[PDB]
């Protein structure tokens with residue numbers, strides 16, 4: 001068969017990540033806190049877990065440039081965590097980094113540790129097309145993110161209809177981060193095209209916000225890895241193993257469940 005316990009026991013790895021609730025946070029505390037110890041969140045538990053199985057040591061580092069990884073339109077150069085990996089500056093990228101076609105062409109991904117899809121976040125119409133087929137209520141996504149790239153690329157009529165809308169209204173309707181989008185829903189009359197996984201989080205934390213419709217597509221977040229990295233195939237197996245016993249479900253339950261609505 002294929003055995004993995006301690007399979008990369010000798011290695012010490014550099015993990016790049018980005019701050020995003022509730023995947024990666026700085027711990028709230030009162031003594032000065034140091035190293036890996038600074039951080040917490042779903043991705044942080046996932047790391048601990050993957051490290052226990054695969055037996056490596058690791059250092060967490062926030063992406064220096066502070067972006068996920070888009071390709072520059074003008075000169076076709078990669079930027080965020082995606083960049084960090086190519087220049088081999090990091091071994092692993094553990095974050096809500098969507099496994100994208102474009103991204104997969106320059107980097108290797110593990111199999112998903114979470115599956116999701118694009119959805120609508122509105123103030124408490126119920127279709128992606130209920131939206132595209134109209135003009136009253138404005139809608140948008142995070143600029144140059146996986147969500148946007150979906151519509152930009154889509155040959156399905158509905159989503160290419162919607163992409164035309166947002167493209168024409170680029171600077172008024174595309175936001176620069178999740179929080180900006182959330183706030184823009186609460187403040188204006190705006191439907192935010194957001195990843196279901198993150199909607200589900202804010203939904204049970206703010207009682208005025210709801211999800212409209214189901215999943216427009218389906219993504220996964222994968223552990224990121226330089227092109228052809230040896231470690232990858234192992235990380236995939238180590239993932240499914242956690243998924244198997246239902247640790248992932250429990251980690252999910254831990255950070256997401258809470259207050260209510």
Ligand SMILES: *[C@H]1O[C@H](CO[C@@H]2O[C@@H](C)[C@@H](O)[C@@H](O)[C@@H]2O)[C@@H](O)[C@H](O)[C@H]1NC(C)=O
Pocket residue numbers: 003004005006007008009
């Ligand atoms: C495989 O995993 C375990 C391996 O433990 C030790 O460390 C690894 C890196 C190898 O070098 C190996 O020689 C050592 O024994 C085993 O303890 C375990 O029985 C194996 N699991 C299965 C079910 O195949």
Ligand SMILES: C/C(=C/C=C/[C@@H](C)C(=O)O)[C@H]1CN[C@H](C(=O)O)[C@H]1CC(=O)O
Pocket residue numbers: 020066067068069070080096097098099141142143144145146147148176177178193194195
């Ligand atoms: C929260 C988020 C922000 C992305 C911001 C872009 C502008 C970037 O900094 O590269 C990511 C996380 N998952 C999606 C992705 O992998 O691209 C994206 C969220 C989204 O597009 O809805």
